[PDB]
Scaffold this active site. Structure first.
Site, PDB file in Angstrom:
ATOM      1  N   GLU A  83       0.841  -1.195   0.000  1.00 53.97           N
ATOM      2  CA  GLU A  83       0.000   0.000   0.000  1.00 53.97           C
ATOM      3  C   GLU A  83       0.885   1.258   0.000  1.00 53.97           C
ATOM      4  O   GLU A  83       1.488   1.616   1.019  1.00 53.97           O
ATOM      5  CB  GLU A  83      -0.938  -0.052   1.224  1.00 53.97           C
ATOM      6  N   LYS A  96     -10.952  -1.792   6.768  1.00 54.90           N
ATOM      7  CA  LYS A  96      -9.810  -1.351   7.556  1.00 54.90           C
ATOM      8  C   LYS A  96     -10.309  -0.958   8.945  1.00 54.90           C
ATOM      9  O   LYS A  96     -11.232  -0.163   9.067  1.00 54.90           O
ATOM     10  CB  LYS A  96      -9.100  -0.209   6.819  1.00 54.90           C
ATOM     11  N   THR A 102      -4.199   5.928   2.346  1.00 62.72           N
ATOM     12  CA  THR A 102      -4.450   7.314   2.773  1.00 62.72           C
ATOM     13  C   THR A 102      -5.128   8.135   1.659  1.00 62.72           C
ATOM     14  O   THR A 102      -4.849   9.312   1.492  1.00 62.72           O
ATOM     15  CB  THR A 102      -3.180   7.988   3.343  1.00 62.72           C
TER      16      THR A 102
END
Lengths: 204, 204, 204, 204
Positions: A39, A128, A68
């Site tokens: 990621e 998440k 993000t």
């Protein structure tokens, strides 16, 4: 397809860095240590360039995604650069809709039962859990009662000492940031190997 | 230009492997450990494919060459695949002429004063010394008297214990095979770092 | 056919003597001790007469060849006297061509990678390594990397203490001179038996 | 005539220096210590001037030659300056032919059996063995079997501790460089005396 990759690989490298060069070196280091899910966070300068320049690792079996992500603009740049999955720290309805229209896996971040139910209503069953260090493995165990079909990927504070407690709580995979990615490229590759071995030793 | 790269980097990884995948993983591992000169030997299956598929590392400052070149056919495939230098275990007049016509650096292998003088007459002043484990650092010291302008890159038996003795004998660089490249990708990256640190500690 | 005989028997007696009578007695002694490959060196007086007079041992399964051949004239006399193989201390292109035209196995001597490649270009893959005591088993191990298909028969300094190290380095056979052939006929027969037993005990 | 001088005197001073003045002082020092064979190497600046200016020592029974000769141009300058013998580190066919036409003794350098046989085919039976520190006295002993008529003059690494081992191996003479010629003129004269006494004590 992305669920089976998370279930198989059990670890995502959450890559934060101060430059394109540092991010690429750390992505290579975690991959050489056996971490296939990578990621690239949008706190990396030119994160879209990093994703694009790492595209050759896909031929070696790396899965490169974006993290993000906090706007549809960032989600667009990530997908255009070849991101195979999108991760955000929050639940974002606009990113959810954009990812659905693009046919790209989106993993929203949640911290509460209300955010979890909102994410489920948008079609998300793999969430998440962020920040993982605040809610802990106890939150994952508590959610198994009312939400048996929801699977978590905790991010924040996952390390070599607690990673097996997260799997014992019933997580699908773990997102590992500073405990994996902090240090020189050599130290990052060694930490990646140590995480893969530790996870194997408590999930087989 | 190639002389200044050998003088700067002081170490060449002499890469032998049983597959394209193993060769690529080991080339990445030595580069992540700080070894920039990478010799893909033609004893690697599809060594030309390995050189071509490693071409992206040149943008990161890797110098990818071909080794164990024993014919003009192999030299041609290496150059067409983007080899930046050619290395052979022997002196080859046909490879010398081909490399000169292509403008590619050739480093012939020599073991005797007669082969050294033949290589000099073909325009070569930077010579592979092979096998280095048979002739030793004593051969390099002996050649300094009659041949002060000849520079050696020994290959064969170079390891962490003797590498500083080779530099004390007056070599330009060292070719390191099994002592660097044998093991898992993680062990190869650690050995690469250890060689770079050991060489620095006796050549600065 | 000669390769399979070298592979089967693993030892060649390199016979030096001061007379025809001494050479014949020593050839009989090594054969009675179980050494079937017998190289009559052209440093023996009337070496062609010795080869001819030993021809009866072929009916008993001895393989009689010529060694220290340094001219086509000597190669001719050896073949006319019934030599089944030719050995030289050096690479000789004229002896190579003559042996090819006669259909007789030639094993040239080499000491360097350049001489090895010249011998390969003349069709030789089984090479005498001479002097073996100077280049050692380390040379054989070093040649396995760049030249995997080349097989060595070292001559010079092979004895009961080091013979198993030569086989561990990957030689096809060994040429044994003074350590086998020096002494009385009785001592030579006992040494031949000891070499055969020692070789068996580290190659089976 | 030159063979009998090498056999009589048993030692050649291999003279390397950084100036004409240093070379002359060292040549005088070795001669005063009892070394009559003096090889002025072409690594000495203006080595032809040194040979010419030492010509007066011939009247005292010094034999002045040239060493490290690597071209016919250098061989010509050496002979025109009054060199009584020529030495090279390698076998050189052009220097061999030039020396034959001039009637000047040439001692080619060899390291291998193949180079030895090439030198013999050019009419040379007295060979420089170089580098002597790499091949050792064992090479000289090994060559006695196949090449009984060849005589060696080893150069490289000959010193007071090993000089008698070289004579026991069957060398004709020894070429001594840094172990004799390094130091002040007084220390060089003392070392020359010590070498002459040590050689006498193991060759009489």
């Amino acid at each position: 397809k992305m669920e089976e990759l998370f279930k198989k690989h059990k670890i995502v490298a959450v890559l934060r860095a101060n430059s394109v060069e540092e991010a690429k070196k750390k992505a290579l280091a975690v991959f050489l240590g056996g971490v296939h899910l990578i990621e690239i966070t949008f706190t990396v300068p030119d994160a879209d360039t990093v994703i694009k320049e790492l595209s050759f690792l896909k031929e070696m079996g790396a899965i490169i995604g974006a993290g993000t992500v906090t706007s549809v603009e960032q989600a667009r740049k990530a997908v255009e650069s070849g991101a195979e999955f999108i991760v955000s720290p929050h639940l974002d309805e606009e990113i959810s809709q954009f990812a659905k229209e693009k046919g790209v896996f989106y993993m929203p971040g949640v911290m509460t039962p209300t955010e979890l139910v909102k994410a489920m209503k948008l079609g998300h069953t793999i969430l998440k859990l962020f920040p993982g260090e605040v809610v802990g493995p106890q939150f994952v165990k508590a959610m198994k009662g009312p939400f048996p079909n929801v699977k978590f990927v905790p991010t924040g504070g996952v390390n070599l000492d607690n990673v097996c407690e997260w799997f014992k709580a019933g997580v699908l995979a773990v997102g590992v940031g500073s405990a994996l990615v902090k240090g020189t490229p050599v130290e990052v590759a060694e930490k990646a190997k140590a995480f893969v071995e530790k996870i194997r030793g408590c999930t087989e």
